Design a protein around this ligand. Structure first.
Ligand SMILES: Cc1cc2nc3c(=O)[nH]c(=O)nc-3n(C[C@H](O)[C@H](O)[C@H](O)COP(=O)(O)OP(=O)(O)OC[C@H]3O[C@@H](n4cnc5c(N)ncnc54)[C@H](O)[C@@H]3O)c2cc1C
Ligand SMILES: Cc1cc2nc3c(=O)[nH]c(=O)nc-3n(C[C@H](O)[C@H](O)[C@H](O)COP(=O)(O)OP(=O)(O)OC[C@H]3O[C@@H](n4cnc5c(N)ncnc54)[C@H](O)[C@@H]3O)c2cc1C
Ligand SMILES: CCC/C=C/C/C=C/CCCCCCCC(=O)O[C@H](COC(=O)CCCCCCCCCCCCCC)COP(=O)(O)OCCN
Ligand SMILES: CCC/C=C/C/C=C/CCCCCCCC(=O)O[C@H](COC(=O)CCCCCCCCCCCCCC)COP(=O)(O)OCCN
Ligand SMILES: CNCCCC(=O)c1ccc(O)nc1
Ligand SMILES: CNCCCC(=O)c1ccc(O)nc1
Ligand SMILES: CN1CCC[C@H]1c1ccc(O)nc1
Ligand SMILES: CN1CCC[C@H]1c1ccc(O)nc1
Lengths: 425, 425
């Protein structure tokens, strides 16, 4: 039996396990899959032999993501930007300008005013309290309704909606305004910052950091799916799909929120958590790597397409590239390549699609979703509580970060807190 | 004897006189100078025979200035923009972009944040209450100190300071932050709007409108300088530099604030007004028309020069133009043409200065100043009170507008209110 069992071998689990180990605790890490890293998943391209790609989490910004920056410095892990953006091919209407910030002068006043309104609203959020504890319910409404009250002209309206679609992984009618404002608050109260945090990538893949961290973790079991966590006795018992149990004084749940509902907790989790847990969050983010021919380097496209964003990812050859598109899996079927072709040619009518690569995170039983985003009304009912301990079971992960939810940084942050909580008695 | 005497034949006096006349009152307008229009002064160029120029007020924006827009529609008075701006020659440092909005991407986050801060502060101002009645004293500090707390990077910092210098007619150390915020509030809570209200000009000069209005005013005396206003009796007595008095039930003071201190009021004006009146406001605006050779059309220059702004005004010929520069008369001596040459060549090293035209508003005894701007600390002590009646004497004018101070629109607004006050008993 162990001081602590960590369930899940993403960045959160890995951090918690390593740090508890270095503190002299006896730790076991159980990972249900065949690999470590979770929603950070670098691997060989399905389309391009010998090419390493990120199929989940990839981007970081050292200034918004200091714990991650610390990890990188700690292990000497190189980063860079994946591409310079120099060619802008927007679909925002005839008055848009082809630049990174495509808003024309005739919209400037409208943007100014909306900027003030969004940031005012964002400043209502205190990041330590939880979204359900601050009288923020009036903001917990469908994003499209919120944006309708800003009454933006066409370019700025579509620009904001596109990036919101991209970033939340939900269409505007399903996204919560409060959640959009949450991401603005997490970026030091900045709208710009949300998109500007796409700043660098791992030069050798996320696996670089995953492997570094795992090297400091003495006991790991892969292919070990936790099905049960029972703290009815003096010591927590963790049952596993095989049926061969492990015991510890403390258990860290570092699996995705949308998979909690498949674990049997004993006793049952506190009742106010239960409904949201059963439902799951509404995240439907979809990231598609697109192998193309005839694309110039450095393309960025933002617009009103079924892909709100489409931008440069990497050089394959003199004539071939990968692009990345974001949409959501409720709106778009990535296995309909004809659809892919249509969505790309909308922005880039000269380009030929050669193929696509993605991971169906929502269909994967180890995840049941991409990154976190609430359904409308969820997190103004319960949010902080999701990542609070239930007796000796701690809940960590990006999904439950108050400080940086949906980011690698949030995984690290939450791990920090569980480790400290465990070290204090 | 008259229902009303109006003192001053600027837009405020003219409006008040006309409207009282049309209401069936018996009105006399006394103007101390040889012309009507006051600080709106179109006349022939000192530099270019046969050319009409604006030596004071010139610019308007129909959307911010609806009363003025009404006047223009009423008399069929044509307007246009004086020039397209197409060539940007800024002195804002090597990272500036040569566009109307010269802020580069690396400053975007900083600007976003400052935008929120300025507008938040501006939203503290309710435009009907007066700046001395709202607990705004913490904002009534030197602009440079306020701007230092925004901690802007270099381009945005200098850009904001330049336009503030231009617009307030005061260097940053003498300008009040609260007053800058007042102009932001007057423009429907917009920073951009302050500069965007430079939108059209009178196609035939301000005198077009002045002449239209004066045609509706049956009794006008020019060269009649008021020296005394005495309401100790039942009927107000207005003494005049000649010594030949006029009497009325009501008197409208529509002369500039900085000339009130030369009038003998009986009884004395209410005591809390007296000190600011004696001191005068701190407006030192200076507008210089510059006759040039070798300038391309459509130039706008903003920067850190002794002229914060320098921009296109009109075509004289294929090789000659007028530009306009704003600075202030405490900082700059317009009769030092060598200085003028230096200030222009800073932005435009290829251009030859042929000559200059301006009016020394501060030296003119009928004005003692250009447009209104408070000294630091003035208007958070007394501001609304300056434009309130003292018994039967009303105070109007741009100088005292709560709603649009320093603009033609403010002259019209204040006249509106005095007329209505007089019509009601
Ligand atoms: C398409 C996509 C793109 C992204 N892009 C970015 C980005 O650019 N930048 C950024 O910062 N973030 C990005 N993210 C978000 C980020 O990758 C995740 O928030 C983060 O990796 C989550 O780490 P974690 O430790 O919370 O959970 P995960 O990485 O999900 O780890 C959970 C672990 O639990 C395991 N598991 C599940 N059920 C069980 C079970 N019952 N028993 C045992 N193990 C179990 C899973 O196998 C997994 O290894 C992206 C996410 C996705 C899906
Ligand atoms: C250089 C400059 C540029 C400007 N640019 C713009 C601009 O682009 N757009 C804009 O909207 N505004 C502009 N303004 C501000 C605007 O012109 C004025 O606020 C407005 O014209 C003031 O009108 P008024 O009726 O309040 O006062 P004024 O126009 O000053 O009228 C005052 C009248 O009082 C007379 N007078 C003074 N003392 C006496 C006395 N004792 N007895 C009898 N008569 C007396 C004066 O002769 C004058 O005719 C500018 C002002 C200046 C100086
Ligand atoms: C009393 C002090 C006042 C201080 C004034 C500072 C602000 C004055 C700005 C004046 C000029 C604005 C020009 C508008 C742009 C334009 O027309 O030029 C456009 C390019 O303009 C733009 O880039 C517009 C995007 C800007 C929106 C940002 C809104 C928030 C900004 C708040 C600013 C705060 C300032 C510094 C802290 C020409 O492309 P077009 O031909 O296809 O169209
Ligand atoms: C969760 C939803 C998030 C919504 C995100 C919308 C905002 C995303 C913007 C992303 C891109 C920003 C790029 C920055 C500009 C750039 O790099 O490109 C620059 C040109 O950029 C600029 O014009 C900068 C001026 C903008 C400042 C305005 C600040 C207030 C704006 C608030 C915005 C609100 C958005 C719409 C309502 C290239 O010249 P350089 O090579 O010489 O340097
Ligand atoms: C840099 N600004 C462009 C807007 C989006 C963005 O910043 C971005 C997008 C992709 C990428 O790899 N790097 C940056
Ligand atoms: C249009 N934007 C440029 C900034 C200043 C400005 O708007 C301006 C200046 C002079 C003029 O005649 N018209 C407009
Ligand atoms: C930065 N975020 C965190 C969750 C999804 C991810 C992401 C990355 C790139 C992009 O264009 N949009 C979203
Ligand atoms: C618009 N304002 C009102 C008072 C001064 C005037 C003005 C006009 C043009 C310019 O560039 N700056 C200031």
């Amino acid at each position: 039996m162990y001081d602590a069992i960590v369930v899940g071998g993403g960045f959160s689990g890995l951090k918690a396990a390593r740090d508890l180990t270095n503190a002299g605790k006896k730790v076991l890490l159980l990972e249900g899959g065949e690999r470590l890293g979770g929603r950070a998943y670098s691997r060989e391209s399905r389309n391009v032999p010998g090419l390493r790609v990120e199929i989940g989490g990839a981007y970081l910004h050292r200034k918004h993501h200091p714990r991650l920056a610390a990890e990188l410095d700690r292990y000497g892990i190189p980063t860079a930007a994946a591409s310079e953006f120099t060619s802008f091919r927007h679909r925002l209407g005839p008055t848009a300008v082809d630049q990174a910030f495509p808003i024309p002068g005739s919209e400037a006043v409208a943007v100014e005013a909306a900027t003030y309104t969004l940031l005012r609203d964002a400043h209502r959020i205190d990041l330590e309290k939880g979204l359900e504890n601050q009288d923020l319910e009036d903001l917990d409404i469908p994003l499209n309704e919120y944006v309708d009250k800003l009454d933006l002209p066409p370019v700025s309206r579509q620009f904001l909606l596109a990036w919101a679609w991209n970033m939340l992984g939900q269409p505007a009618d399903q996204a919560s305004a409060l959640w959009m404002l949450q991401l603005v608050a997490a970026h030091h109260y900045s709208i710009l910052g949300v998109v500007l945090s796409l700043d660098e990538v791992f030069s050798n893949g996320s696996a670089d950091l995953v492997d570094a961290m795992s090297q400091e973790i003495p006991e790991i079991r892969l292919q070990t799916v936790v099905t049960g966590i029972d703290q009815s006795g003096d010591v927590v018992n963790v049952t596993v799909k095989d049926g061969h149990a492990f015991q510890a004084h403390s258990v860290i749940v570092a699996t995705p929120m949308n998979t909690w509902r498949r674990i049997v907790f004993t006793p049952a989790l506190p009742e106010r958590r239960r409904s949201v847990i059963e439902e799951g969050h509404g995240g439907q983010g979809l990231k598609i790597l697109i192998h193309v021919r005839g694309a110039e380097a450095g393309i960025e496209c933002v617009g009103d397409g079924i892909f709100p964003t489409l931008y440069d990812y990497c050089e394959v050859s003199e004539s071939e590239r990968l692009l990345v598109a974001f949409t959501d899996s409720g709106s778009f079927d990535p296995t309909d390549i004809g659809a892919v072709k249509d969505a790309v040619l909308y922005y880039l009518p000269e380009v030929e699609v050669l193929g696509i690569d993605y991971h169906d995170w929502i269909a994967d039983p180890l995840f049941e979703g991409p990154w976190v985003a609430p359904r409308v009304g969820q997190f103004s009912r319960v949010h902080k509580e999701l990542g609070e301990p239930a007796g000796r079971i701690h809940f960590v992960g990006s999904d439950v970060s108050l400080e940086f939810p949906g980011y690698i940084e949030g995984a690290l942050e939450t791990a920090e807190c569980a480790v400290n909580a465990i070290l204090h008695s």
